[PDB]
């Protein structure tokens, strides 16, 4: 799943196997450089791709004046009463009406979903 | 509605350089992720690590008409970590009353002064 | 102090009145034209590369500064006169202002001698003038003055 | 030993230098002094768990400049010089980055307004003629 | 509803949670303990693959909800994949009791015994997800 | 224009790699792969090009989006080779390679993203902006950013008499 | 100790003119440069154009070491300045303006497909198979 570049010419490293050792290797095309593979997973394709939207949220959104603010959902970390909530509005979800809360307290960008 | 006539972005660019904005030619690409891109008239000028302070400063300057003229647009896309500044002609704008702390900055003294226009 | 709701309706239309007392209703037209004459025309002339001739003597031409006079009309006898907008409407004239530019001509004759002459205010054409713009004759005329010119 | 060879003695000495960006007025004042021999003094105050860096403008030069440090891990900056004798040399490696900011909040903008006015002084614009050129 | 399922097109992508490709050199200790629990059972007395087996592995995780909605069975999917590709690929799947539905896919042993062995498995992955009809 | 090819095309190689990004530069008949344009700018190593397109390598979803584009331009691994490739499609055929490279540099220097810069030292500035365009395209494809609305008047300008007249005057003064 | 409340003050000196101009050399952090291995270094102007208005070319340890190409920074510091502070025995800081800013990017040293040969690989527009094998032929 990870992406690596050869230390020689900083080009994309692609997977390759060695029959003699039967161990996964990452080899650079234009460089002939080789590296020992530690992940063992060439790639993972997520059809559902249920990526946690909380990671995608930016804590700075609390500074948006147009986002609604609720005092009924205190921050779980710092306990601040005021919080700003919004919807994902991210494509490829095929369904999105749940609210994502972000603590409005400065220096506490805590984010959660009820 | 008013249509902006346009003005030079030079004063804004100079102020941004004076302010704590890192030039695009001097930074490393790794620093762009956390910082917010600064666009002036569609040209990516640099990045800033304190967008909230910069926007407050920019808004203060435009309201005081110090370095930023009235018809200059300052847009901060908080989600996209971008600050877009526009100075060119053809932008449609309208005058709006400023509100701070749920209070109009327009007070009775302004109305009284206008009454004797 | 603070505008109470009982006085907001009067207060807001005092604000709107002052806006139109200043801006008017065709401000976008006039401001755009004023910028073109005041800034764009000069910038376009300044941005133009100097004309270099070489075919030996070398001639350089640089267009320095732009001048614009009042909208003028020339009688068949050649006498200039200010062109009132009403005269332009009646006599089917074009409301245009003469355009002049300062041109500096420097010649290098390969003899290590440079001769520089400036042709101040060289006529380069006529720019149609938007009415009631900063460069229009009606600009800065009181309503009484406009009536004397048969202008509404 | 060759003309194109670059001296690396400074790097071998692990020489440390600081990269600082300064405003125009501070540089302009230094240029105005023309290098008399002194333009100010840099003061560094280190606390139990914090460090403070500031620069003081010379009183004669005028007739505070707090310094904000920046992380250097984002880039590796080294200084190289080209001597007039055509002998390139590496002065050293930058070990800290800082920025100089003014102390004035609002009154500073007045200086900028003049500076913007000075910058716009040579911006020529069309002139209006009372009479048609004859 | 039985007629509805028999008509509405269902490709592998619909009931597939995710697909991953691992090198998987040793089939016994394939990737992680989760596969170890049931992969051995197939490999205690394996058939039609004792000769050889491709190194690269294509692991498919199937959504339980989507499978239940269309009343699809893992054996049927394996037969469908087997029918489409014949003996070109070897399909190993876990029992339905396990909370996670898995389906290990590899390439024929005869080929193991020209494009590439990992890129080709990638082509099959996309081919099975969209073109293959369940 | 920076465009991502549709997935409609069916193939073992096309389907596996995904969708590739191509750039429609001015004065070029045919679409140019995006990674070639970055090579022509002076960024050869994949790490360097991706640093201008992807600002966070920790995100794997965006990295996989540019992989098909890297493979498309794998043949071109030098700036001069990339410049020749763009010049080959130029407005006029290049008699010799030197003319092609010079023409390609001419287009990139001034005809491509002129607002970013029109000088010879603006390659880094154009690489960042071109990477931002690719980055913007990836966000749209990934669904992380909504597609822009043509009807939005934020994305609109009104040409009044001034800009209109100035456009005419530039042509007339050049004629003069 | 004294470090908990240490206070230091140093003077600033700005010499009028210096015999040697000061420039800035920048390397990417991901490049992982190592000055210890820099046994030899050669810095010469590039010859691609064929002087002061051309990019620089940096060569380290001859052909064996990594080769970097320098490019002058396009941006102009008309409203900004850059200075370098160097420690000296006298203890008074010295500020030297930077004449120019240059960015150096490493150059790969391996068989690169020629432009004429790249045309041949263009026929395999997307029909390319086993991308690894392409460089084996070269
Ligand atoms: Zn390599
Ligand atoms: Zn909180």
UniProtKB/TrEMBL annotation, chain B:
Subcellular compartments: Nucleus
Domain RNA polymerase Rpb2: where?
38-100
Q: Give the highest taxon in the source lineage.
A: Eukaryota
Q: What does this protein do?
A: RNA-dependent RNA polymerase that catalyzes the extension of a non-coding RNA (ncRNA) at the 3'-end using the four ribonucleoside triphosphates as substrates. An internal ncRNA sequence near the 3'-end serves as a template in a single-round Pol II-mediated RNA polymerization reaction. May decrease the stability of ncRNAs that repress Pol II-mediated gene transcription.
Q: Which family does it belong to?
A: Belongs to the RNA polymerase beta chain family.
Q: What is this protein called?
A: DNA-directed RNA polymerase subunit beta
Origin organism is Sus scrofa
The shown range, given as first to last of full length, is: 656 to 772 of 1300
UniProtKB/TrEMBL annotation, chain E:
Q: Give the residues annotated as coiled coil.
A: none
Where is this protein localized, as stated in its record?
Answer: Chromosome; Cytoplasm; Nucleus
Q: Which domain of life is it from?
A: Eukaryota
Q: Which family does it belong to?
A: Belongs to the RNA polymerase beta' chain family.
Q: What does this protein do?
A: DNA-dependent RNA polymerase catalyzes the transcription of DNA into RNA using the four ribonucleoside triphosphates as substrates.
Name of protein: DNA-directed RNA polymerase subunit
Source organism: Sus scrofa (Pig)
Could you say which residues of the full protein are shown?
1155 to 1298 of 1970
């Amino acid at each position: 799943v990870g992406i690596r570049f050869c230390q020689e010419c900083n080009n994309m490293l692609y997977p390759k196997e060695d029959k003699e050792n039967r161990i996964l290797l990452y080899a650079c095309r234009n460089c002939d450089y080789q590296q020992e593979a530690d992940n063992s997973c060439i790639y993972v394709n997520k059809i559902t791709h249920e990526v946690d939207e909380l990671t995608q949220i930016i804590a700075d959104v609390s500074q948006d004046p147009t986002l609604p603010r609720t005092e009924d959902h205190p921050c779980q970390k710092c306990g601040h009463k005021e919080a700003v909530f919004f919807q994902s509005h991210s494509a490829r979800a095929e369904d999105a009406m749940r609210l994502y809360y972000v603590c409005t307290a400065p220096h506490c960008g805590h984010r959660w979903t009820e | 509605a008013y249509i902006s006539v346009g003005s030079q972005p030079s004063p804004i660019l100079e102020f941004l350089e004076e302010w704590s904005m890192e030039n695009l030619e001097e930074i490393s690409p790794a620093a762009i992720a956390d910082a917010t891109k600064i666009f002036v008239n569609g040209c990516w000028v640099g990045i800033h690590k304190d967008p909230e302070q910069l926007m407050n400063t920019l808004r203060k300057l435009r309201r005081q008409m110090d370095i930023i003229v009235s018809e200059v647009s300052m847009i901060r896309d908080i989600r996209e970590r971008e600050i877009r500044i526009y100075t060119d002609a053809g932008r449609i704008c309208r005058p709006l009353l400023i509100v701070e702390k749920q209070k109009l900055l327009l007070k009775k003294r302004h109305i009284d002064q206008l009454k004797e226009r | 102090d603070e505008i109470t709701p009982d006085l907001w309706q009067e207060a807001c239309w005092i604000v709107i009145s002052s806006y139109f007392d200043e801006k008017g209703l065709v401000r976008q037209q006039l401001d755009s034209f004023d910028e073109f004459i005041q800034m764009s025309v000069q910038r376009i002339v300044e941005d133009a590369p100097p004309i270099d001739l070489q075919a030996p003597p070398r001639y350089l031409l640089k267009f320095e500064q732009i001048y614009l006079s009042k909208p003028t009309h020339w009688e068949r006898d050649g006498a200039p006169s200010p062109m009132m907008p009403n005269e332009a409407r009646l006599r089917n004239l074009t409301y245009s202002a003469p355009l002049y530019v300062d041109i500096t001509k420097t010649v290098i004759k390969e003899g290590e001698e440079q001769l520089q002459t400036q042709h101040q205010k060289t006529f380069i054409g006529k720019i149609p003038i938007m009415l009631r713009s900063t460069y229009c004759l009606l600009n800065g005329l009181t309503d009484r003055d406009l009536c004397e010119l048969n202008e509404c | 030993a060759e003309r194109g060879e670059l001296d690396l003695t400074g790097a071998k000495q692990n020489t440390g230098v600081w990269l600082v960006k300064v405003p125009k007025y501070l540089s302009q004042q230094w240029a105005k002094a023309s290098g008399r021999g002194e333009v100010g003094k840099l003061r560094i105050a280190k606390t139990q768990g914090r460090t403070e860096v500031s620069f003081t403008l010379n009183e004669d030069l005028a007739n505070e400049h707090p310094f904000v440090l920046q992380s250097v891990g984002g880039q590796t900056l080294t200084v190289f010089t080209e001597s007039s004798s055509d002998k390139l040399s590496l002065e050293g490696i930058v070990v800290q980055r800082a920025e100089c900011r003014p102390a004035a909040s609002e009154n500073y903008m007045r200086l900028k307004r003049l500076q913007i006015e000075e910058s716009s002084k040579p911006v020529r614009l069309s002139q209006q003629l009372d009479k048609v050129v004859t | 509803k039985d007629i509805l399922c028999r008509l509405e097109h269902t490709t592998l992508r619909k009931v597939t949670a995710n697909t991953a490709i691992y090198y998987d050199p040793n089939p016994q200790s394939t990737v992680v303990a989760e596969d170890q629990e049931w992969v051995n059972v197939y490999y205690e007395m394996p058939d039609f693959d004792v000769a050889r087996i491709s190194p690269w592995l294509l692991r498919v995780e199937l959504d339980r909800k989507h499978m239940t909605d269309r009343k699809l069975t893992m054996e049927q999917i394996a037969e469908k994949i087997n029918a489409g590709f014949g003996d070109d690929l070897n399909c190993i799947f876990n029992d339905d009791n396990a909370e996670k539905l898995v389906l290990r896919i590899r390439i024929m042993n005869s080929d193991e015994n020209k494009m590439d062995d990992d890129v080709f498995l990638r082509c099959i992955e996309s081919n099975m997800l969209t073109d293959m009809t369940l | 224009w920076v465009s991502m090819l549709a997935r409609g095309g069916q193939g073992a190689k096309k389907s596996a790699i995904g969708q590739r990004i191509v750039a429609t530069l001015p004065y070029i008949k045919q679409e140019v792969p995006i990674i070639i344009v970055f090579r022509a700018l002076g960024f050869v190593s994949d790490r360097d090009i991706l640093e201008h397109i992807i600002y966070d390598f920790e995100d794997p979803e965006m990295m996989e989006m540019v992989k098909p584009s890297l493979d498309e331009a794998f043949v071109i691994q030098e700036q001069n080779v990339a410049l020749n490739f763009i010049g080959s499609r130029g407005a006029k055929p290049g008699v010799t390679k030197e003319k092609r490279i010079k023409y390609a540099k001419e287009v990139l220097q001034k005809e491509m993203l002129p607002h970013v810069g029109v000088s010879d030292f603006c390659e880094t500035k154009k690489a960042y902006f071109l990477g931002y365009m690719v980055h913007r395209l990836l966000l749209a494809a990934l669904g992380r950013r909504e597609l822009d609305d043509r009807d939005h008047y934020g994305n609109k300008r009104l040409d009044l008499a001034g800009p209109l007249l100035a456009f005419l005057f530039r042509g007339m003064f050049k004629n003069l | 100790g004294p470090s908990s409340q240490n206070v230091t003050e140093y003077v600033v000196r700005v010499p009028k003119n210096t015999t040697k101009k000061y420039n800035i050399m920048a390397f990417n952090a991901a490049d992982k440069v190592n000055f210890a291995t820099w046994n030899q270094a050669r810095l010469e102007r590039d010859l691609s154009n064929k002087p002061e208005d051309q990019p620089w070319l940096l060569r380290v340890n001859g052909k064996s070491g990594r080769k970097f190409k320098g490019i002058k920074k396009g941006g102009v510091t008309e409203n900004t300045s850059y200075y370098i502070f160097t420690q000296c025995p006298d203890g008074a800081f010295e500020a030297f303006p930077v004449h120019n800013w240059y960015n150096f990017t490493p150059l790969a040293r391996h068989r690169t497909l020629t432009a004429e040969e790249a045309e041949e690989e263009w026929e395999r527009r997307n029909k390319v198979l086993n991308h690894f094998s392409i460089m084996q032929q070269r």
